[PDB]
Design brief:
The structure is cut from a larger assembly and holds 6 copies of chain A. The first copy, chain A, is of the alpha/beta class. In chain A, strands 3-2-4-5 form a 4-stranded parallel sheet, with helices on both faces.
Amino acid sequence: MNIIKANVAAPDARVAITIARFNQFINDSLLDGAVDALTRIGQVKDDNITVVWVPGAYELPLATEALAKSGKYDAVVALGTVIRGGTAHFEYVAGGASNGLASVAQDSGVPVAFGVLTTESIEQAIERAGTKAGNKGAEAALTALEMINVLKAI
Amino acid sequence: MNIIKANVAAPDARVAITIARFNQFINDSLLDGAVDALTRIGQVKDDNITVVWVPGAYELPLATEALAKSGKYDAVVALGTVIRGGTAHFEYVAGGASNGLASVAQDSGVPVAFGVLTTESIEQAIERAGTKAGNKGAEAALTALEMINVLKAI
Amino acid sequence: MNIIKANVAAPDARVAITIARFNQFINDSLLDGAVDALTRIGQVKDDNITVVWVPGAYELPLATEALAKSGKYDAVVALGTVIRGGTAHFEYVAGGASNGLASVAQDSGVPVAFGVLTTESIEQAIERAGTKAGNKGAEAALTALEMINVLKAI
Amino acid sequence: MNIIKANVAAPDARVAITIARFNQFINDSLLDGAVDALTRIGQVKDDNITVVWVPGAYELPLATEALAKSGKYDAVVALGTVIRGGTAHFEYVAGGASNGLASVAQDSGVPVAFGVLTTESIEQAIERAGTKAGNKGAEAALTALEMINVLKAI
Amino acid sequence: MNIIKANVAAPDARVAITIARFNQFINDSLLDGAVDALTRIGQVKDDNITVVWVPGAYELPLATEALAKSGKYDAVVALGTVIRGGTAHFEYVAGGASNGLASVAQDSGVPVAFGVLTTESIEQAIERAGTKAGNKGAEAALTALEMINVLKAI
Amino acid sequence: MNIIKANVAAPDARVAITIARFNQFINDSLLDGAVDALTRIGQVKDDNITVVWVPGAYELPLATEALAKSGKYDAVVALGTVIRGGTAHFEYVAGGASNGLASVAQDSGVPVAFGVLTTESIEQAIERAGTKAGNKGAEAALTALEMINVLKAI
């Protein structure tokens, strides 16, 4: 029985990271995590890393499509933060950028990390971006990498 | 009146099983169920079974597309576990991987088992992965098989 | 005054372990315990251990009768898990498989370990199958062994 | 270490199904499940299936004894439904027909499926005979078959 | 300004993993995590991994001392689980095995991963050994590795 | 991948058991357990067992140091009982005799079993010294033994 388990190192790969500046104070750690994990752990040279900055998490898709489409990159790490509020705007943003980044994947064949925090409080976000419960940004990068070699393994 | 009822044996197909390592402690039984049911019940030789390991349940799709697309396999058994928490991350993961694996089906013609536990507690998950209420992993495999022969029957 | 105290080592005797796959996620540790204790502690060679897998705990008896009857084995370790639910099905299963395995004993002269968890929750079962309160599976094996030498001592 | 895991297919075996007509409205699905699972999954020819109809679940034993005793059949699937009521009649029926079918097993060596619903409501029974929580009738048949090959494996 | 950041790969150094069998049902995943992360992520060959099995978490120290002392190994991953109960036994065990493994470090110069779950429920432990909140076992190994190269970097 | 699993038999090695007479009515079973398990299970000859009686559990350490130090013994089983009361005397005793026996270990290389009940009631102690929840005294001896062979295995 043949099994495919893939590691998170991939010294070559050119990875593209996209980020929303809205909720910067939180998305900024997400990048730090991502990049660190990318180089340090994934053996990626820091010039095979390009970082595209779109305004809001709602724009993450188009960005990560023009990227993956381009072809130059082996994976895109999508980094954003959406914290619910007064209205169900959160609903449509978080969603249109989940279903978004998701469709960009299935249409490009390029793996894309859903590094988008969809929470309820700054409290929860600060938890999931460096403190108590990890740093999804980095995670997103590792899962990015891994997926690179996984797809490669077929 | 002609009726199509198909059995779960198919000691001929090559099945591909994909799995998220996140929630391993629970997804691991899912695999055990799947594989057992696959061979034991489905008469499948254990070298026509390949098992691809992606990080998270969010990645199950791309994996199961590269697989089905490939052509080598007659069906893909998707195995993952998503248990709700503080935020509606659960929402987007579970969803983007349900609608995901769903689309991979209708676009590849390759049957795909939705063996993804979408629950509320480790309590519920442990129920649905071996104990009280069956072992969806195995089920997923049987439904996988059956569907193989069902499709074949047209 | 002559006293009979018997140890748990018995590197010769061939032990047969029977197991219900229902509640696999719990019964599986029961087996691990059983086997470890059997070899490691009981000095049993791992080819004098045969493991029969019946569907449900209700079937444990017939299995462990055909075994003991057979004669080849020196003791049978019965391993199953029954957790109560909506109806008193638990009642009849647990019972018909307690009184069952019991009768197989008195009619075969072959010791049989009642390694069947009869509980109320997955919580309680997980306690009694490796965690907080031991690992009845193993226990069942040791009591199995000991009994071998105890009977022998008469 | 030698392990016995047995499949649910068994072409040449002749299975005898017994059924109580009391609670027909519920037992009837039990039969449908049983038979379907018997042929479809177990590869059993529908003329090696005989179906004996006794009045009440209390009678299931004698029926399933004269059957197994007879010898012609490789296993008996016992199908009935007992739903508690005003008195503890349920107690004695369900019991005398659990311990019953149990004894018929250990004395005939012929596996017998305990496909008898012992519940509290039509609600629970309808759950356990086709809807929400499976279709014990079918299950009873599969466990029946499996046991056939399991015993055979010794 | 010179900075020391170290990666988690180290395909040459021989790691020793120690484990308490008490709370097996939980410590077993701890091992699975550890090992996977060790090889898969850390590039460690699976014969440079030795696994010592002590009875209880209280014994973890002496084991991990005889190991590190020995010299053959570059790091020890300590894996155990202690879940509080009726008395403050938990107190002394968890403690004497924290301060324990700690002292073994500072006296051997060999890094040691504190992969010992000190919780309040099987619920919490199952969270911290594969499911909801990661798999400390794996973590312990990565921190183990990293520390190898960190120390090396001085 | 090389694994070290050790059994509890060790008919050579000379074990020294130490015991507090305070709480005799409870510690006495602790000894019975210990000794039984030692000989019966561990194959230890009853003249390779010496039993030192110190007044209180606070004294257990010095006793078990002069012993291990001595060299004649292969392991020390420490047996005492401390049940909390009006003041936090319990605190300092239980502690100074946990940390105590712990240090004697790491400084002598001689395994030492922490067979000291640290409870809240005679109720709890009677549970943990023969009745409901085992007989820690015996346990302490087995873990003693096992550790002997475990250390030996390096």
